[PDB]
Enzyme design. Structure first.
Site, PDB file in Angstrom:
ATOM      1  N   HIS A  32       0.809  -1.214   0.000  1.00  0.00           N
ATOM      2  CA  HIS A  32       0.000   0.000   0.000  1.00  0.00           C
ATOM      3  C   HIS A  32       0.844   1.267   0.000  1.00  0.00           C
ATOM      4  O   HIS A  32       0.281   2.363   0.096  1.00  0.00           O
ATOM      5  CB  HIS A  32      -0.968   0.005   1.191  1.00  0.00           C
ATOM      6  CG  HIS A  32      -0.299   0.129   2.526  1.00  0.00           C
ATOM      7  ND1 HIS A  32      -0.321  -0.882   3.464  1.00  0.00           N
ATOM      8  CD2 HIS A  32       0.391   1.148   3.090  1.00  0.00           C
ATOM      9  CE1 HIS A  32       0.336  -0.494   4.542  1.00  0.00           C
ATOM     10  NE2 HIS A  32       0.779   0.734   4.341  1.00  0.00           N
ATOM     11  N   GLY A  79       3.403   5.788   9.991  1.00  0.00           N
ATOM     12  CA  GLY A  79       4.748   5.650   9.484  1.00  0.00           C
ATOM     13  C   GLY A  79       5.488   4.431   9.989  1.00  0.00           C
ATOM     14  O   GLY A  79       6.575   4.132   9.481  1.00  0.00           O
ATOM     15  N   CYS A  99       4.557   1.424   9.545  1.00  0.00           N
ATOM     16  CA  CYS A  99       4.300   0.295   8.666  1.00  0.00           C
ATOM     17  C   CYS A  99       5.584  -0.137   7.972  1.00  0.00           C
ATOM     18  O   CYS A  99       6.425   0.691   7.608  1.00  0.00           O
ATOM     19  CB  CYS A  99       3.230   0.652   7.637  1.00  0.00           C
ATOM     20  SG  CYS A  99       1.538   0.322   8.188  1.00  0.00           S
TER      21      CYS A  99
HETATM   22  C1  LIG Z   1       1.391   1.517   9.567  1.00  0.00           C
HETATM   23  C2  LIG Z   1       1.330   2.925   8.995  1.00  0.00           C
HETATM   24  O1  LIG Z   1       2.372   3.568   8.777  1.00  0.00           O
HETATM   25  N1  LIG Z   1       0.098   3.427   8.741  1.00  0.00           N
HETATM   26  C3  LIG Z   1      -1.171   2.734   8.970  1.00  0.00           C
HETATM   27  C4  LIG Z   1      -2.216   3.182   7.958  1.00  0.00           C
HETATM   28  N2  LIG Z   1      -1.599   3.553   6.668  1.00  0.00           N
HETATM   29  C5  LIG Z   1      -2.656   3.691   5.643  1.00  0.00           C
HETATM   30  C6  LIG Z   1      -3.838   2.736   5.702  1.00  0.00           C
HETATM   31  C7  LIG Z   1      -5.120   3.175   6.062  1.00  0.00           C
HETATM   32  C8  LIG Z   1      -6.192   2.285   6.108  1.00  0.00           C
HETATM   33  C9  LIG Z   1      -6.017   0.935   5.794  1.00  0.00           C
HETATM   34  C10 LIG Z   1      -4.741   0.509   5.436  1.00  0.00           C
HETATM   35 CL1  LIG Z   1      -4.489  -1.195   5.029  1.00  0.00          CL
HETATM   36  C11 LIG Z   1      -3.655   1.383   5.383  1.00  0.00           C
HETATM   37  C12 LIG Z   1      -0.805   4.801   6.845  1.00  0.00           C
HETATM   38  C13 LIG Z   1       0.231   5.043   5.717  1.00  0.00           C
HETATM   39  C14 LIG Z   1       0.163   6.407   4.995  1.00  0.00           C
HETATM   40  C15 LIG Z   1       0.070   7.593   5.966  1.00  0.00           C
HETATM   41  C16 LIG Z   1      -1.005   6.437   4.000  1.00  0.00           C
HETATM   42  C17 LIG Z   1      -0.053   4.773   8.189  1.00  0.00           C
END
Ligand SMILES: *CC(=O)N1CCN(Cc2cccc(Cl)c2)[C@H](CC(C)C)C1
Ligand SMILES: *CC(=O)N1CCN(Cc2cccc(Cl)c2)[C@H](CC(C)C)C1
Lengths: 306, 306
Positions: A41, A143, A145
């Site tokens: 993602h 962040g 992730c």
């Molecule tokens: C782990 C991490 O850095 N983040 C958790 C959510 N990420 C986007 C998201 C939102 C909803 C569902 C899923 Cl699978 C993923 C975020 C990453 C960026 C800020 C888009 C942060």
């Protein structure tokens, strides 16, 4: 003596964390040999997450659209592929700090250490367990992730988890290093519910054996019980049913303390019905289930690693 | 979201642990630059510990009596000296993995990470606090002596503890890196009693602010209180008295949550008198005091290190 929620040394994992940036999204990646692993993602925007078509989104990306950064060393992507829910970014430079690693898919109830990272930089380390509902109760911010979970077997690092998302309920879900999610979760921004979270009974028993080793013996009672009568009480309080394999794993702990497994189950049965009477066990007013029998033996014997 | 007892990454400390052997005793040492630091009781036998004369014992030792071992690299001692309760073994080879380090003597109430080692090999990492009675509630077995405690300030490693002995009561005592014991303890095998262990009040307040950030707000009450009336109740339950400096440290947490420090003290006062009613806060049925206000801000903001 003493008993602490102990994590593995993170030195061999710190040298593998890199910063991955695709467009505007930036998260963490795992750099092993000449391949970088990261959640897929990272190619999405804030609007794509509601219903992403990862195949169509990946078509509009090329090798020069991803930017992998190892501290201050700029890497170059040669090939990219999508294995399930993770991206495999093939780079030109092999990581000189690549340890003897191994990809493993753990079972619910097992424990592992998490190295929480942000922008490819380590922030902290803690120990946690895979809940029976395939979630983990971790500590993750935006962040984080791409942060990975791992175990260490002497000189081998066993990667078993990569953080992908936080559920609206506050718990965390992720995949193995092959990109397969633990549980029925999908990597999209939608309401997803986890199952009923039960207590890992075999872990609680191992924790009580650790308590006897460290001097807390007040919970040892006069009674014994059967394996069926214990499971009848355990399922009433949402505890995992105990099997014969669980009794075999607790064998060494039974031989060291001289207490039979069924006798320890009788003590646990009385604790589930009568509570703890405001007292503590190993400094805790609740029953802990984040220590496997191997964790107890490791901490109570002094097992070292490379 | 989420809150875990989080330790610092141990990578920069793993490369500094060595195995020190003098005669038959073998423990851990800290290799920084061309000096190795280790507890001075490594020169003792099982019979010397009841009443050791370290000066007389050190006279009968020469540079070739100590054997420092860094994994498989054999080091050579050029000069040896005794600074208080630690030995300074000057070696020929400077540690190529020496980070930007610093020796600090922490105050009671501060937290640090412990890298438990055996035979110079890392075993695990956990976070703990210096109790008000200058002890720590760690997890140490025989051979873990020489293991160090540390904090990380971005790119600097601040060593603050070296493990020396386990009291007959099960708690642990040690020195700073200059060899000065935390507390009134001496490095000899005799009955030594620690003072009354109180609860770090400023840490509990920081922990409650972390709970409000993560969604647990049931303990927030309608009342307020004064700084004197709170300390009157706190001293009844063996809590450290709260000062104005403690209120100033909790300033940022008060601004982020919009809850005044005195209002949070009123919630704590009611918890001390009425208990927790069988409920939990951040998954704990007891009040935690091993999180400093800086630990909470660090975990709730995502602070990374080199
Ligand atoms: C782990 C991490 O850095 N983040 C958790 C959510 N990420 C986007 C998201 C939102 C909803 C569902 C899923 Cl699978 C993923 C975020 C990453 C960026 C800020 C888009 C942060
Ligand atoms: C930390 C460690 O390795 N040990 C703790 C006790 N050491 C000896 C001792 C006994 C009593 C008082 C004091 Cl200050 C020290 C042990 C080292 C060897 C086995 C003698 C183990």
């Amino acid at each position: 003596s003493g008993f602490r929620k102990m994590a593995f040394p993170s030195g061999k994992v710190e040298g593998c964390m890199v910063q991955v940036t695709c467009g505007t999204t930036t998260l963490n990646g795992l750099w092993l040999d000449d391949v970088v692993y990261c959640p897929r993602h990272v190619i999405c925007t804030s609007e794509d997450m509601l219903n992403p078509n990862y195949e169509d989104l990946l078509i509009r990306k090329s090798n020069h659209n991803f930017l992998v950064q190892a501290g201050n060393v700029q890497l170059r992507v040669i090939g990219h592929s999508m294995q399930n829910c993770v991206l495999k970014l093939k780079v030109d430079t092999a990581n000189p700090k690549t340890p003897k690693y191994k990809f493993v898919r753990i079972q619910p109830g097992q424990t592992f250490s998490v190295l929480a990272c942000y922008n490819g930089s380590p922030s902290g380390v803690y120990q946690c367990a895979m809940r029976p509902n395939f979630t983990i109760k971790g500590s993750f911010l935006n962040g984080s992730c791409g942060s990975v979970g791992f175990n260490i077997d002497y000189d081998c690092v066993s990667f078993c988890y990569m953080h992908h998302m936080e559920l609206p309920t506050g718990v965390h879900a992720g995949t193995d290093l092959e990109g397969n999610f633990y549980g029925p979760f999908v990597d999209r921004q939608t309401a997803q519910a986890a199952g009923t979270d039960t207590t890992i009974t075999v872990n609680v028993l191992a924790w009580l054996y650790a308590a006897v080793i460290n001097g807390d013996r007040w919970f040892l009672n006069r009674f014994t019980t059967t394996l069926n009568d214990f499971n009848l009480v355990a399922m009433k309080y949402n505890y995992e049913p105990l099997t014969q394999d669980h009794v075999d794993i607790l064998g060494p702990l039974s031989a060291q303390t001289g207490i039979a497994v069924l006798d320890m189950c009788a003590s646990l049965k009385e604790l589930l019905q009568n509570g703890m009477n405001g007292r503590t066990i190993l400094g805790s007013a609740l029953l802990e289930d984040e220590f496997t029998p191997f964790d107890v033996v490791r901490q109570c014997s002094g097992v070292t690693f490379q």
